Ligand binder design. Structure first.
Ligand SMILES: Nc1nc2c(ncn2[C@@H]2O[C@H](COP(=O)(O)OP(=O)(O)NP(=O)(O)O)[C@@H](O)[C@H]2O)c(=O)[nH]1
Ligand SMILES: [Mg+2]
Ligand SMILES: [N+]
Length: 401
């Protein structure tokens, strides 16, 4: 992996079937007619898992690479199915900016809201909107109506909704055009120009993040698998610092105790790296651990730079039924799921002696006790889900134990 341009992590979010995967595929084809380094990815190359073919939806987050003239992108395509929100969050947790896909035909839908909300509670700082399937919507009035709703929906979850770029296009027709002529450059085709229009927005609207490569190494693990000839790979986006082959690193969280290992390889999009730095989306080849000894939700950290915790105080907003949350309140003993970056863990809600009940729409402080240790830190935003439903959004305010 030779690096020439700044690197940025983007991805696709939005409601089920709105066209996130098709857009992703389209992006690779369009980009590759300019930059020959870009490897094109077909629809089936992205939704490739047997279970994805079987069920006809995206299930796993896929990582595709493309590039523009200005920057190198790692793109994380997420599922929109309500049942795979867990995966969407882990994808979003790797994004420096997200492309919210919204179908012009259907308008914003329940996971349009939930994905914006969750993107925030995993720190996604910027959103561009791609209004898709415009080739099915003749009436300009609705298109304006759809934009209006999306811009306002973003304003609710504290995104500059009146400001975000909203690119109107058709992911399918661009992708069809690139299939008919892969050498199709900018300007020759109106649909392919809409993708360029999207690419331009990402280039200019989504800024390259400030990344501290001097702080202790920290990579939240998004995934773990086995490379047949090499070993166990933990993947993820390096949050800070650097990792080289030969470094001792600690696997932190989700197990009773931390374990140390030696990095024996580092790869970004299958091209081996010498070193991995903050921002990079890498695979870290770990030694002496099977894929049963590392998992999604743990972090790789500079040995002893991080202490996992189980108990904290949070400032929490409980969603209203209208925002897709609970219809009724909960008491102490409520045992929902908590999502921090790529981590997902059961915790126990313990309210203050005065507080007997927490109602939807309430802002409240309580203390949470997790059933496994996790890499936490003051100020870390998180999400609460339970019963296939996002119920709350909070932030750690004080680490207790
Ligand atoms: N007419 C039209 N159909 C489109 C367009 N983009 C996608 N579609 C169709 O919409 C369907 C869903 O597209 P897909 O990319 O799978 O959506 P998704 O958002 O990735 N779904 P999921 O939430 O499962 O990941 C497919 O049948 C696809 O062909 C478009 O621009 N125009
Ligand atoms: Mg998809
Ligand atoms: N996928």
């Amino acid at each position: 992996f030779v690096r020439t341009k700044p690197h940025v992590n983007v991805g696709t979010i939005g409601h089920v079937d709105h066209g996130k995967t098709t857009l992703t595929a389209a992006l690779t084809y369009v980009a590759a007619a300019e930059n020959p380094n870009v490897e094109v990815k077909d629809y089936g190359d992205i939704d490739k898992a047997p279970e994805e073919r079987a069920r006809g939806i995206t299930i796993n987050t896929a990582h595709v690479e493309y590039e523009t003239a200005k920057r190198h992108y790692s793109h994380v395509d997420c599922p929109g199915h309500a049942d795979y929100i867990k995966n969407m969050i882990t994808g979003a947790a790797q994004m420096d900016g997200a492309i919210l896909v919204v179908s012009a035909a259907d308008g914003p839908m329940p996971q349009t809201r939930e994905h914006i909300l969750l993107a925030r509670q995993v720190g996604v700082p910027y959103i561009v909107v791609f209004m898709n399937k415009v080739d099915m919507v003749d009436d300009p009035e609705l298109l304006d109506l759809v934009e209006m709703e999306v811009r306002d929906l973003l304003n609710q979850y504290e995104f500059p909704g009146d400001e975000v770029p909203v690119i109107r296009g058709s992911a399918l027709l661009a992708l069809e055009q690139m299939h008919r002529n892969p050498k199709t450059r900018r300007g020759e085709n109106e649909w392919v120009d809409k993708i360029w229009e999207l690419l331009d927005a990402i280039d200019e609207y989504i800024p390259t993040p400030v990344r501290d490569v001097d702080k202790p190494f920290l990579m939240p693990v998004e995934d773990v698998f086995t490379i047949t000839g090499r070993g166990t790979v933990a993947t993820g986006r390096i949050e800070r610092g650097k990792v080289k082959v030969g470094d001792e690193v600690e696997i932190v969280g989700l197990a009773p105790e931390t374990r140390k290992t030696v990095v024996t390889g580092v790869e970004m999009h299958r091209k081996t790296l010498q070193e991995g730095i903050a921002g990079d989306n890498v695979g870290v080849l770990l030694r002496g651990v099977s894929r049963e000894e590392v998992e999604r939700g743990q972090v790789l950290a500079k040995p002893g730079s991080i202490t996992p915790h189980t108990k904290f105080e949070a400032s929490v907003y409980v969603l209203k039924k209208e925002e897709g949350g609970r219809h009724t309140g909960f008491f102490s003993g409520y045992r929902p799921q908590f999502y921090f970056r790529t981590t997902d863990v059961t915790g126990v809600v313990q309210l203050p002696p005065g507080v007997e009940m927490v109602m939807p729409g309430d802002n409240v402080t309580f203390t949470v006790e997790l059933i496994k240790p996790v890499a936490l830190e003051e100020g870390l935003r998180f999400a609460i889900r339970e019963g296939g439903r996002t119920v709350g959004a909070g932030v750690v305010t004080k680490i207790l134990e």
